[PDB]
From Swiss-Prot, chain A:
Domain of life where this protein originates: Bacteria
Source species: Neisseria gonorrhoeae (strain ATCC 700825 / FA 1090)
Disulfide bonds: none
Protein name, entry field: DNA mismatch repair protein MutL
Protein's job: This protein is involved in the repair of mismatches in DNA. It is required for dam-dependent methyl-directed DNA mismatch repair. May act as a 'molecular matchmaker', a protein that promotes the formation of a stable complex between two or more DNA-binding proteins in an ATP-dependent manner without itself being part of a final effector complex.
Similarity-based family: Belongs to the DNA mismatch repair MutL/HexB family.
Full-length numbering of the shown residues: 464 to 654 of 658
Length: 186, 176
């Protein structure tokens, strides 16, 4: 499998550069990972009817605005279907006991807040909150992508996952430079 | 652990103890009444009498007329309850000794109960009638160190209102 590229390193915070047969390729990690996460979450939603969940140490100290607690009082079965299981601590606070896998890694409060504030005004009936709203984690925002034996895993983003070239707007998420970057040296 | 660890009191009747579950409201007077009842019965079936304690400056009751004759009736029963009392004169009496585990109290009340019961047989006037002292009624609430000792009430003792937990964030429903 000669892939898109072979990840070689990071680029100052937002790009991941990968060498291939052509040249080094600059993948916008957050954008490409948002695309692939949206794709994988919808593929895992059309099948089995729920997102993959995961628990975790150290719950989050939600702080849970008033009516979001009542939204959790409303059937949390849908919340379990989004991979987010969370519990009430008292007064008007919460804490997530389980976050969906494929995101993790921080700020689970934002994901749970998005879906829980969506639980107001039951009608659901849209299901396109699983997009950038629920994909409001993407990959790592600007910090770290390990020591490379996971960078190639994101470099495998668009293999067997469609909607590659055109992003959520049309902005490219990868290659611009070719082997003929020697012109830049003039 | 278990039953918690006493942290404070609530206005004079409750002692709240912190546990792994939550804080538990113990009715200190009722809990002490139960523990004293159990201790007195345990000290009664064994040794056949309660532990007496002589005290300074005895208290003199009032001693209605037939109660003096009841004292003339065998006082060894009163000594069996840990109550030694003498006649001062006229129609009045005074406890030279009071039972331990009850100590400071309206000792006149305990003596009067056991003496007015002498109007034979029976044994269970050692219950709340003799536990008409319990702990200190609603004050003086000795601090946390001995509060834990009170929290060891049902430890070593079995046995009509319950004397503990209600906190399950039901006060949350009462306030939210």
């Amino acid at each position: 499998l000669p892939p898109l590229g072979f990840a070689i390193a990071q680029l100052l915070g937002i790009y991941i550069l990968a060498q291939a047969e052509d040249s080094l390729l600059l993948i916008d990690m957050h954008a490409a990972a948002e695309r692939v996460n949206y794709e994988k979450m919808k593929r895992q939603r059309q099948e089995n009817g729920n997102l993959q969940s995961q628990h975790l140490l150290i719950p989050v100290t939600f702080a849970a605005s008033h009516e979001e607690c009542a939204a959790l009082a409303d059937h949390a079965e849908t919340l379990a279907g989004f991979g987010l299981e969370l519990s009430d601590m008292g007064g008007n606070t919460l804490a997530v006991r389980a976050a969906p896998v494929m995101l993790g890694k921080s700020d689970v409060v934002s994901l749970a807040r998005d879906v829980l504030g969506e639980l107001a005004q039951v009608g659901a009936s849209h299901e396109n909150r699983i997009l950038a709203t629920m994909s409001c984690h993407g990959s790592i925002r600007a910090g770290r992508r390990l020591t490379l034996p996971e960078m190639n895993a994101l470099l495998r983003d668009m293999e067997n996952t469609p909607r590659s070239n055109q992003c959520n707007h049309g902005r490219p998420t990868w290659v611009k430079l070719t082997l003929k970057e020697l012109d830049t040296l003039f």
